[PDB]
Amino acid sequence: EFNILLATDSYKVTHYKQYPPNTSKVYSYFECREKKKYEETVFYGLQYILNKYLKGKVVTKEKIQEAKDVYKEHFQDDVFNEKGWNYILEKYDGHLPIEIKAVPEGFVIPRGNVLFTVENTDPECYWLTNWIETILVQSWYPITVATNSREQKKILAKYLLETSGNLDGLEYKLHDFGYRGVSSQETAGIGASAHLVNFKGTDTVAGLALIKKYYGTKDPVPGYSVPAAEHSTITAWGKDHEKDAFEHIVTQFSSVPVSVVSDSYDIYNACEKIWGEDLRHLIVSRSTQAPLIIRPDSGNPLDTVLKVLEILGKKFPVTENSKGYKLLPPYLRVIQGDGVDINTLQEIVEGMKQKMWSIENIAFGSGGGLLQKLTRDLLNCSFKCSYVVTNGLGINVFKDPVADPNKRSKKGRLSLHRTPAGNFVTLEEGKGDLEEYGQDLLHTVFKNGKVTKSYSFDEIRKNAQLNIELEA
Amino acid sequence: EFNILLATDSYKVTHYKQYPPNTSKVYSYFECREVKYEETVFYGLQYILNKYLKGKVVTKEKIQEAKDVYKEHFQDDVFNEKGWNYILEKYDGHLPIEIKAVPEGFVIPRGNVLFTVENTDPECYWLTNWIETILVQSWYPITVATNSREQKKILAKYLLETSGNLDGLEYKLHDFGYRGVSSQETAGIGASAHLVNFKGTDTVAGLALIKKYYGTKDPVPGYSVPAAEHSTITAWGKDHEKDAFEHIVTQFSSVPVSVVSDSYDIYNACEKIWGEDLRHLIVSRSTQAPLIIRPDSGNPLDTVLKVLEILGKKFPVTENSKGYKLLPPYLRVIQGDGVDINTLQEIVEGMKQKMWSIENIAFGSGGGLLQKLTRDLLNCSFKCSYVVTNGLGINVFKDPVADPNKRSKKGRLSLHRTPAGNFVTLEEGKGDLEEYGQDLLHTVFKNGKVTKSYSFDEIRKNAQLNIELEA
Numbered sequence: 001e002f003n004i005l006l007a008t009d010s011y012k013v014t015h016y017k018q019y020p021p022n023t024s025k026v027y028s029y030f031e032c033r034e035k036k037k038y039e040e041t042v043f044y045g046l047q048y049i050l051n052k053y054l055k056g057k058v059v060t061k062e063k064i065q066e067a068k069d070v071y072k073e074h075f076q077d078d079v080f081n082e083k084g085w086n087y088i089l090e091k092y093d094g095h096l097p098i099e100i101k102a103v104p105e106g107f108v109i110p111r112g113n114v115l116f117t118v119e120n121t122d123p124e125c126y127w128l129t130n131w132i133e134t135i136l137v138q139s140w141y142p143i144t145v146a147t148n149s150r151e152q153k154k155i156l157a158k159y160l161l162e163t164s165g166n167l168d169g170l171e172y173k174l175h176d177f178g179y180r181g182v183s184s185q186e187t188a189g190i191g192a193s194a195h196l197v198n199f200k201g202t203d204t205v206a207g208l209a210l211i212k213k214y215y216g217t218k219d220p221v222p223g224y225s226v227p228a229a230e231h232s233t234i235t236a237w238g239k240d241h242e243k244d245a246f247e248h249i250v251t252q253f254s255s256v257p258v259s260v261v262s263d264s265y266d267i268y269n270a271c272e273k274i275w276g277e278d279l280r281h282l283i284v285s286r287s288t289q290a291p292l293i294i295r296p297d298s299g300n301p302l303d304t305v306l307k308v309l310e311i312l313g314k315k316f317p318v319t320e321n322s323k324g325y326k327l328l329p330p331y332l333r334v335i336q337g338d339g340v341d342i343n344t345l346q347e348i349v350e351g352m353k354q355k356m357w358s359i360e361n362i363a364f365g366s367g368g369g370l371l372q373k374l375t376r377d378l379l380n381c382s383f384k385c386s387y388v389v390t391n392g393l394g395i396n397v398f399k400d401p402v403a404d405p406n407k408r409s410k411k412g413r414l415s416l417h418r419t420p421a422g423n424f425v426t427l428e429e430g431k432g433d434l435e436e437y438g439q440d441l442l443h444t445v446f447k448n449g450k451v452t453k454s455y456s457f458d459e460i461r462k463n464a465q466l467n468i469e470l471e472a
Numbered sequence: 473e474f475n476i477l478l479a480t481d482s483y484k485v486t487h488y489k490q491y492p493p494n495t496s497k498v499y500s501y502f503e504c505r506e507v508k509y510e511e512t513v514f515y516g517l518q519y520i521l522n523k524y525l526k527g528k529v530v531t532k533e534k535i536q537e538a539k540d541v542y543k544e545h546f547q548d549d550v551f552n553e554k555g556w557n558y559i560l561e562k563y564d565g566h567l568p569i570e571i572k573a574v575p576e577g578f579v580i581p582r583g584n585v586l587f588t589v590e591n592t593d594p595e596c597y598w599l600t601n602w603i604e605t606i607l608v609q610s611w612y613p614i615t616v617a618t619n620s621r622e623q624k625k626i627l628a629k630y631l632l633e634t635s636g637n638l639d640g641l642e643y644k645l646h647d648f649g650y651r652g653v654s655s656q657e658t659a660g661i662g663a664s665a666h667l668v669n670f671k672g673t674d675t676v677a678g679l680a681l682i683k684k685y686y687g688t689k690d691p692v693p694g695y696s697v698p699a700a701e702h703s704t705i706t707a708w709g710k711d712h713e714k715d716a717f718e719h720i721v722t723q724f725s726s727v728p729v730s731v732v733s734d735s736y737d738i739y740n741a742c743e744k745i746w747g748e749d750l751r752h753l754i755v756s757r758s759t760q761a762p763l764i765i766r767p768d769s770g771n772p773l774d775t776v777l778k779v780l781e782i783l784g785k786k787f788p789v790t791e792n793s794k795g796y797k798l799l800p801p802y803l804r805v806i807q808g809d810g811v812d813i814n815t816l817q818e819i820v821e822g823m824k825q826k827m828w829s830i831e832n833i834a835f836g837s838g839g840g841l842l843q844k845l846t847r848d849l850l851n852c853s854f855k856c857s858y859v860v861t862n863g864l865g866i867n868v869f870k871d872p873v874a875d876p877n878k879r880s881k882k883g884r885l886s887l888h889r890t891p892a893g894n895f896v897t898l899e900e901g902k903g904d905l906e907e908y909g910q911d912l913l914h915t916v917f918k919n920g921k922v923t924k925s926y927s928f929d930e931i932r933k934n935a936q937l938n939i940e941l942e943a
């Protein structure tokens with residue numbers, strides 16, 4: 001069983017001895033700090049943390065004893081606020097005396113804004129606010145996944161709209177291939193959920209159960225997939241029988257979409273001779289609802305996509321859509337599932353546009369780039385104390401390191417507001433209380449061990465919509 | 473509860489329908505194919521076997537749940553309920569799979585077989601690659617352990633050069649990554665991988681992982697000491713940084729204590745607060761209880777060098793037997809910002825150029841140590857090499873025209889010692905020729921049971937540096 005007393009950075013175990021004496025309140029906040037191409041961030045993932053780790057009876061006498069035993073050895077010393085944790089167990093039946101206020105999940109907010117705040121609701125527990133920094137700060141991950149994935153949707157939407165005149169199929173244009181390429185099962189479920197904020201295609205099955213249990217959708221499931229080959233299911237036929245494997249596979253899955261990896265030996269041969277001649281009669285007969293999706297998986301991503309499109313365009317009948325771009329027949333599409341990240345995604349669609357290929361021809365699969373190749377530095381996700389009450393006097397506190405202004409933190413009690421032009425501003429020094437802006441956009445989501453305000457996955461998807469989708 | 477029927481890539485649910493008819497065996501292997509990372513530490517498969525693969529992993533409830541989920545996920549019924557029922561009925565839900573693997577902690581050059589997977593029942597030919605996804609997650613502990621060991625090699629080189637010994641090495645790179653990884657589970661796994669090489673960690677989650685899955689003779693495998701954060705300094709108010717420092721070092725007067733010193737002005741803090749106002753409370757400390765000053769901002773090399781220069785003018789520096797400058801034993805520095813393998817190398821080299829011993833410094837690394845890593849670094853990859861269809865074995869492989877680096881190995885594999893004492897991977901069942909002695913892989917899982925396992929102490933021993941072996 002998870003133990004909250006063992007889920008912090010070692011050194012925070014020692015912080016209750018370090019705050020000013022006579023401190024009754026420690027108030028802290030999280031922001032994606034501005035760095036003076038990710039100017040706004042999707043806030044998503046805190047509700048998972050709240051429910052899985054923070055709510056309810058999270059302190060027991062056994063958990064207190066276990067932590068005591070581990071820390072004695074880990075520090076070779078007895079430092080460990082047993083009394084403080086006992087107090088929570090005795091007075092509040094092990095529920096955390098904490099209040100967290102947060103912008104609504106799905107909200108899209110420019111950098112350098114307060115996204116959530118954390119404070120203790122009992123003076124005895126001034127040390128508890130920053131105890132839970134470590135676990136709360138892991139929110140960086142679903143925020144960053146959701147944000148990076150939304151930025152890739154923006155690129156796709158722009159190029160799809162330019163080359164086709166509409167957004168049809170956008171929500172299936174970046175599929176999650178990341179299950180194997182992330183660091184753990186738990187990471188899998190959280191990352192795949194964050195991607196589904198923006199798209200509907202996933203092979204990372206772990207995300208589905210996460211969303212059902214912590215967020216929920218009207219629909220049975222949040223994300224979808226279709227049958228597809230891997231190198232094993234082709235190479236197992238023998239080097240001389242790739243055509244046999246292709247023929248068997250597309251015939252097995254004759255009435256649904258099916259994607260077939262085509263680069264086991266020579267992708268260009270497979271497209272031109274195997275699909276484009278030997279097995280062509282099995283492809284041209286397919287339903288628009290059941291295309292063959294050819295998948296290259298090696299070579300320079302851009303050069304390979306362009307050469308595969310050139311090959312297919314000569315073996316299959318291509319049309320020119322109303323915007324002037326070339327379009328494969330509806331029973332044939334391509335997915336590039338190797339080497340995709342936000343930078344290469346952009347290079348490919350721009351490359352396709354230069355060569356007059358519509359983005360309606362293509363979809364992308366991304367694994368490590370989507371779910372693993374991200375860090376807390378990308379959006380400068382950071383948690384800092386801004387306000388403390390000592391001797392009954394509040395003071396506004398901050399860091400401001402001389403050699404890096406970008407690390408200066410905000411001061412005092414914070415609130416998030418709509419500006420007169422309809423943007424966002426964070427008010428410092430308790431200035432929200434002056435009521436010169438509308439209401440504070442942070443809402444209490446957790447208080448004294450109970451989750452107080454929750455969002456469905458459907459609402460979150462609504463909140464994270466692109467401006468061009470809204471315009472449609 | 474974890475469900476192995478729901479822990480694979482979606483498309484693998486459909487693979488049972490795509491292998492050649494009459495296939496009875498699918499045999500697959502994992503390798504790290506191909507800043508140089510020429511050799512990898514194999515670590516973390518044992519966690520996965522125990523936590524996810526062993527024992528009764530299939531129930532009637534788990535089958536029905538998978539069934540229900542895939543029906544919606546595919547908008548169709550493609551799930552192999554019959555195949556999964558066969559496991560439940562025939563084997564009480566234990567996986568009929570055999571996995572052979574090199575010993576954990578082993579340090580093996582790139583491009584060698586590390587583990588192999590095959591079904592032990594012909595009906596379960598499809599199961600070998602169902603569990604690709606979960607097994608390939610081993611890339612993460614391997615890669616963390618490996619990059620952490622590469623950093624240890626750098627620190628050893630320079631500590632040996634500037635001090636004449638390796639005293640302190642195992643505490644020179646501390647894990648600060650708990651908040652910077654993608655999840656709790658990731659925290660425990662990657663912290664454990666770093667502890668293969670070092671003993672300093674703040675990522676508490678690794679301690680219970682190691683105790684449950686590997687074990688150590690010692691009560692715990694990793695340690696920490698008291699330290700401030702910005703909140704415990706800034707809470708005193710901007711004009712009271714001195715007061716905060718004094719309170720903290722007096723609270724922790726007889727154990728090591730680290731104090732972040734750049735909340736406002738790191739160079740002021742070192743020269744005037746520590747070096748003048750509070751100097752009398754630092755020069756009185758025990759060798760066993762130093763103050764460890766922590767910068768946390770600015771250019772990491774420039775800041776370390778200026779911090780050491782400031783301190784060397786306020787405190788009595790000696791010159792050790794190698795000609796390098798050393799702080800008094802009650803004073804040390806830790807650089808815990810911007811540290812990855814590249815900046816770690818830049819800092820130690822810049823210290824060496826300025827005649828500072830590496831004894832003076834320790835490093836903390838978070839995102840750089842535990843999160844800034846992918847499966848592409850070591851090219852961790854799982855592929856089928858051998859299948860039996862209609863009773864005939866065939867050697868199979870991929871060989872993409874545009875990328876020879878992605879070519880995979882062929883046939884039944886085994887791992888051998890060469891006449892010169894190195895590793896070689898034999899393909900095509902050639903290990904059976906008996907020209908290169910015994911297979912170095914061991915059966916670690918068979919039919920639901922873990923059959924061979926390693927303590928964390930053995931793993932640490934296997935993972936030692938050659939410089940460490942030398943004296």
Ligand SMILES: O=C(NCc1ccc(S(=O)(=O)c2ccccc2)cc1)c1cnc2n[nH]cc2c1
Nearest residue numbers: 175177201203226228257259293335363481483
């Ligand atoms: O093909 C794979 N999964 C199946 C798959 C996934 C996505 C598509 S798609 O073209 O985006 C598509 C998605 C939804 C509906 C129609 C078409 C088609 C097939 C696949 C392929 N390679 C992978 N490596 N790692 C995980 C992987 C998953």
Ligand SMILES: O=C(NCc1ccc(S(=O)(=O)c2ccccc2)cc1)c1cnc2n[nH]cc2c1
Nearest residue numbers: 009011646648672674697699728730764806834
């Ligand atoms: O200082 C921190 N942790 C305590 C700590 C860690 C490491 C050392 S050390 O100087 O390497 C040391 C380790 C072991 C024994 C003696 C000295 C001293 C203190 C710390 C500081 N910043 C952090 N950010 N994220 C996690 C963090 C942890």
